[PDB]
Amino acid sequence: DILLLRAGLPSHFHLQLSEIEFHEIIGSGSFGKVYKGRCRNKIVAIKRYRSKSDVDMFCREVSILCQLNHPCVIQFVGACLNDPSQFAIVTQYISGGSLFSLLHEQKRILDLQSKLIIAVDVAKGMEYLHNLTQPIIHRDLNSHNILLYEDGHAVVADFGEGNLRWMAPEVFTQCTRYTIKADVFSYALCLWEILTGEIPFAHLKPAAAAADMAYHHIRPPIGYSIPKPISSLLIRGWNACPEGRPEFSEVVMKLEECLCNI
Numbered sequence: 001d002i003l004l005l006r007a008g009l010p011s012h013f014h015l016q017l018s019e020i021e022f023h024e025i026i027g028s029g030s031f032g033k034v035y036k037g038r039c040r041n042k043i044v045a046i047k048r049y050r051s052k053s054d055v056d057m058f059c060r061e062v063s064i065l066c067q068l069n070h071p072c073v074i075q076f077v078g079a080c081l082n083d084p085s086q087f088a089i090v091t092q093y094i095s096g097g098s099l100f101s102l103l104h105e106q107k108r109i110l111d112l113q114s115k116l117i118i119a120v121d122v123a124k125g126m127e128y129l130h131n132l133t134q135p136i137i138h139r140d141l142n143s144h145n146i147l148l149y150e151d152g153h154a155v156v157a158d159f160g161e162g163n164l165r166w167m168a169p170e171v172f173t174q175c176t177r178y179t180i181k182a183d184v185f186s187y188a189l190c191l192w193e194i195l196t197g198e199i200p201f202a203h204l205k206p207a208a209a210a211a212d213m214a215y216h217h218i219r220p221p222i223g224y225s226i227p228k229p230i231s232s233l234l235i236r237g238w239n240a241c242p243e244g245r246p247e248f249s250e251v252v253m254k255l256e257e258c259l260c261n262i
């Protein structure tokens, strides 16, 4: 199974653990630890791994990562595949921190152009993922999974955390496979999060906020201040009906159009 991955993975992506230099620990998880370090004269982040469940996730992640090549998506450096002790995933380190920190922790006041540049960059990355021959549903797009360069540009990542006529809506929805349009919903919430500088339903806990969007059809408030083209993107973006949400190819277009008038 691992051998099948070794073969499909381009040779230049093959790392030897000795090639990788581990400095500090940045985060933890079910998979193991995430180190910062140095590899091939680059400052990198290393996802070091500690069952068949765990390995299935490892192969999945590498298979995803070796395909990704876009300036708005995380950048794969390589993977070490010799034996399950040495399993690691290396990516180019990004130093500007998450979008979450910029908005809610550093609480920095942002120009509309600064806001729109991050928003466009995230839309491009998503457009990229959705337009792969085998499209990738991020499924967990949020401001924690959006990293920033020091000049204000953004990158999309993933830290890794019967008859229908009479069916209850919650039951119907579980029988309906979700699509890439699930990312457009998440994205819309991020877009609101950018412009307002507030966490979506900040006064609520996560599961409480989710229930109000699903059961009670509540969205974050869209003020008059927010520009017409973007408030439009919001309205259509977090539409309960997936088919009513726009593609990222259109999202990029509308947003780039805005960057010209600013």
Ligand SMILES: CNc1cc(Oc2c(Cl)cc(NC(=O)Nc3cccc(C(F)(F)F)c3)cc2Cl)ncn1
Binding pocket: 026, 034, 045, 046, 047, 061, 064, 065, 068, 073, 074, 089, 090, 091, 092, 093, 094, 095, 097, 129, 136, 138, 147, 156, 157, 158, 159
């Ligand atoms: C703190 N600066 C960092 C941290 C860092 O850690 C990471 C991150 Cl953030 C991500 C990943 N790997 C992935 O994101 N993999 C992935 C899997 C499925 C889909 C996607 C995507 F991009 F399509 F959403 C990405 C690994 C590490 Cl070590 N990396 C850089 N700078």
